[PDB]
Design a protein around this ligand. Structure first.
Ligand SMILES: [O][Cl-]
Ligand code: NA
Lengths: 125, 124, 125
């Protein structure tokens, strides 16, 4: 019915949330932020941050039995709409052949003062 | 498609409903900390968070779901410095069951509240 | 999974599509108030809301869905002071059918538009 996805390959979801759920053949990821497995921000650089988020999401999807080519929808929450071209360049490297639906908005603030946070909805397989 | 609107909460006034149910999935509206009179309960962020989750529990129940069936939660907040206080209350509702979550600080919330939460949940 | 791109609307720039359709559901990209020339139709927030909802009406049709099939709307806005005016336009599109909704004020939207709306919808019949 429902699967709860948590991988020690990734920085822990501390406290009351998990890396992803799988319900009715759909994966719902948590928002990923640019932490490595030690739970440290990888870089001040917004392109380095976007790559770590997308590398994190590739692992979530693998563990949930999905892949990037199965993504229906991404939401990109960012700190600075002026970084959008830089973020979009890196995103386009992960979403080349497959181009899912997307929304990108500038928020006030992200966890740990990170610059980018991305959540996915993906199909199993 | 089933439209959910419970009289156990203040009416969703204007062009929305408490939730919809489609293909065995409940999509809640973003709840804000209105009491049953439709007044903001308090300026206190832990009270607001509790009011929001109490409201969402009633929505899930009237939609044929429950908090243990939640897939995904999105938490929109006014102040990321309140995150630990919000998380404490949140973990009283999602204690054994820990669904997927995103939490961002927005610029401003309806009625200048400090938290709004929406859920995606499985029908039991 | 089906990819939706309509020529009726300004092209998705780079690595996204107008919508995806997967397991009987349409996920739309967030629509901003661009006309078919990809220009911001107007400074007026009610004209912008109208263009957004006209753009989403066409995505839903191309996806094989409609406004009376919508499960969930997310309304991103630049100014909570505009909420009454946006809601007035939105209620014209959602009078017979009232979906679930979330509405939040973001710091900034693409091209400094005042409103952006994404939808999750059921395939029609
Ligand atoms: O939060 Cl991984
Ligand atoms: Na993360």
């Amino acid at each position: 019915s429902m699967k709860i996805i948590n991988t020690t390959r990734l920085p822990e979801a501390l406290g009351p949330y998990s890396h992803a759920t799988v319900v009715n053949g759909m994966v719902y990821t948590s928002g990923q932020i640019p932490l490595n497995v030690d739970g440290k921000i990888v870089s001040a650089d917004v392109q380095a941050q976007t790559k770590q988020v997308l590398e994190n999401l590739k692992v979530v999807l693998e563990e949930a039995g999905s892949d990037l080519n199965s993504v229906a929808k991404a939401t990109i929450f960012i700190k600075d709409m002026n970084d959008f071209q830089k973020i979009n360049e890196v995103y386009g490297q992960y979403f080349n052949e497959h181009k899912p639906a997307r929304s990108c908005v500038e928020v006030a603030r992200l966890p740990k003062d990170v610059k980018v946070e991305i959540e996915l909805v993906s199909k199993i397989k």
